[PDB]
Ligand binder design. Sequence first.
Ligand SMILES: [Ca+2]
Ligand SMILES: [Ca+2]
Ligand SMILES: [Ca+2]
Ligand SMILES: [Ca+2]
Ligand SMILES: [Cl-]
Lengths: 112, 111
Amino acid sequence: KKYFMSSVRRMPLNRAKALCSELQGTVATPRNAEENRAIQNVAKDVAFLGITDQRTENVFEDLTGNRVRYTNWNEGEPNNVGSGENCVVLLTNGKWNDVPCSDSFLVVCEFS
Amino acid sequence: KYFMSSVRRMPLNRAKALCSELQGTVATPRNAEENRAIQNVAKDVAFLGITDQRTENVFEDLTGNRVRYTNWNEGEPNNVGSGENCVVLLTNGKWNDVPCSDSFLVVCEFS
Ligand SMILES: [Ca+2]
Ligand SMILES: [Ca+2]
Ligand SMILES: [Ca+2]
Ligand SMILES: [Ca+2]
Ligand SMILES: [Cl-]
């Protein structure tokens, strides 16, 4: 099964990726509502998910460039505000929001 | 318990920081079964969450609890040189006490 663990500190996506990979895991990518809720269980505050539309705007892929199916966008999202929000975070209500990849949030790593 | 190994080597302080970052701790085998599980996740010599920093020759986990199960390599623990207060799991599953300042892989443990 997948196991989810949340970080203590906040960091931008690249550092989040490096953290999870240090222990041979990846940034949590929920594939369904059950997994989304499991990530919610460990995330005490807004946290990065392993999803981005960095390749093509409004086409969301996991960090391995594999287009995702399941999404749980908060109402009004994704809105790509300003210069661009190409990363994704899980809000404390379980819904998602696109944010700048350079902004800092907790990270939830995924292992199996 | 779930065990994960790092890919890079680092001293105990950085190892502890790494496991703590994801709310886990450096792996401490409580029996032969856990010892094997940790050995398998590690591809090379790795730190365990055991030290005798507080009292020499009194090995305890990172929370001060004295360890019961031990799997010392023949001749260990020997506290050689100017001292060896940390512990690593060798590639054969046995343990060796080493300087906490030295760098090895780390296996973190989660519940
Ligand atoms: Ca975008
Ligand atoms: Ca947004
Ligand atoms: Ca010693
Ligand atoms: Ca020794
Ligand atoms: Cl030492």
